[PDB]
Every structure is written in structure tokens, then in C-alpha cells.
């Protein structure tokens, strides 16, 4: 996360770290007591459940809970060349005991309204500037949804943002997800104080460039896939 702050314990109870060969690699979100929603490209080099561990807690050095992984499911039509359908599910070896500090985020409704300029929070242990290292302490940053068409401007991504994707950032830049934040959530609170995952951190041109906002998997576009795989 660029331009954000350290999250407090319990702020983001669905956030998890995914560790490959005992190092933080990607973020994810609990969507029930067995399942974590994340990005496909996290598993491009290794998709062996035995080599992955999930953790909960604001700290990756001193986690509150370590959880073994049993299954990794990559979207059937994930295409790395165009970043399309960059989405994955991870099923845990044992159910997680839900508490105030550790529990699930809501999936959005198929008709969820997500206006441009609307506020959202992105969370993770990613780098604090382009080319930096990951951090041990969870960070959060506040950003605004940017319309797909504006994001597709010739001076921006110029047609690369597709319908199952979404963009977010701030006009002057400096606030964004970075390398190490992939698979983490982009969340909005509704007026009943429930939080919904609208995006999954996916890709972008560097990090924090004003003309290049963060690109995220649009979760509404994958609801039917998720329900099939998980019953959620």
C-alpha cells in the first residue's frame, strides 16, 4: 500500500496473508469459515497446497493464527496475457473459528451500485513505493472508484480495462496497492455498516502513478462462479 496507514487490530477481520515457502506473497479475504478469495496470478509459479500457509493478524512476523491450505482453485478462464478472470479460491485444511477479530467479509449483490468517486479501502502488506519490499505490518489506504472508461483513456490503460475489472485511486496519485498486495480486498461499507468486497487487487502500471490507477478484479462479475465452487 502506497500513501496509507498501519491498520489497527480488528479493523479488517477478513484480511489474510498467504505465505509461499514461509514468505508473505499475496493477500486474501475470508468469505466463510473454510474459504479465502484471492487472485489467480498468485499461484502462477507454485499451486501446491502443501507449500502455502494463510495467516490472520495485522502482523506477518507475529500472526494471531496460522492455517494450512488444502485446495487451490483457479478460475477456468484465467488468462495471464490480458489479466482476465484473475481470481482464485483457497480452501483451508480446517475451519476457522470466527471471532470479533477474525471473520468473513460480505460478497456484493449482483446489482450492487458502485459509483465513480465513491470511497473504498484497500488493505495489504505490499510495498510502500514502487520497487520496495513488503512490510510486516498491515496497511490500509483510502481510494476512489474511477470509471472503467476514464481508466481506459489513451493516456491511461487505453482499452486494457475489461468488464470484469475495476479501477480505483486518487487524482494526484500516491495512494494505491503495490506488489505484494495482490489478492487483497477493496471494500466498501453500506449504510447499515456492513462491508462488501467490490474488488481484488490484480495489476497496474507501477504503483501510485496519477495516470495509472490500480486495477482490480470486479467481484460482482464472478458471483456465480464463487457460489458454484463454495455454495456461498
Amino acid at each position: 500500500i502506497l500513501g496509507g496507514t498501519e491498520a489497527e487490530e480488528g479493523s479488517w477481520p477478513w484480511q489474510v496473508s498467504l505465505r509461499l515457502n514461509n514468505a508473505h506473497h499475496c493477500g486474501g479475504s475470508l468469505i466463510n469459515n473454510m474459504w479465502i478469495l484471492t487472485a489467480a496470478h498468485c499461484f502462477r509459479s507454485n499451486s501446491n497446497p502443501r507449500d502455502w500457509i494463510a495467516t490472520s493478524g495485522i502482523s506477518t512476523t507475529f500472526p494471531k493464527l496460522r492455517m494450512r491450505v488444502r485446495n487451490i482453485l483457479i478460475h477456468n478462464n484465467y488468462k495471464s496475457a490480458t489479466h482476465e478472470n484473475d481470481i482464485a479460491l483457497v480452501r483451508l485444511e480446517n475451519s476457522v473459528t470466527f471471532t470479533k477479530d477474525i471473520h468473513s467479509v460480505c460478497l456484493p449483490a449482483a446489482t450492487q451500485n458502485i459509483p465513480p468517486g465513491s470511497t473504498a479501502y484497500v488493505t495489504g502488506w505490499g510495498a510502500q513505493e514502487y520497487a520496495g519490499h513488503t512490510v510486516p505490518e498491515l496497511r490500509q489506504g483510502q481510494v476512489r472508484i474511477i470509471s472503467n472508461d476514464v481508466c481506459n483513456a489513451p493516456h491511461s490503460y487505453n482499452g486494457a480495462i475489461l468488464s470484469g475489472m475495476l479501477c480505483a485511486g486518487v487524482p494526484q496519485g500516491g495512494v494505491d496497492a503495490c506488489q505484494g498486495d495482490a489478492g487483497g480486498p477493496l471494500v466498501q461499507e453500506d449504510s447499515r455498516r456492513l462491508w462488501f468486497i467490490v474488488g481484488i487487487v490484480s495489476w497496474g502500471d507501477q504503483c501510485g502513478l496519477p495516470d495509472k490507477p490500480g486495477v482490480y478484479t470486479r467481484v460482482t462479475a464472478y458471483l456465480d462462479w464463487i457460489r458454484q465452487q463454495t455454495g456461498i
Binding site: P13, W195, F196
Partner: peptide, 18 residues
Amino acid sequence: LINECGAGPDLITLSEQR
């Protein structure tokens, strides 16, 4: 919280209050 979803800390503490 429980097998429900989306609850921040303030929502949980509220629901605990009698």
C-alpha cells in the same frame, strides 16, 4: 462475529450491548 458477514468492530460491540 458469526456465520454472517461484513461486520466491523463497532457493529459487533453494538450487538453485544444489552
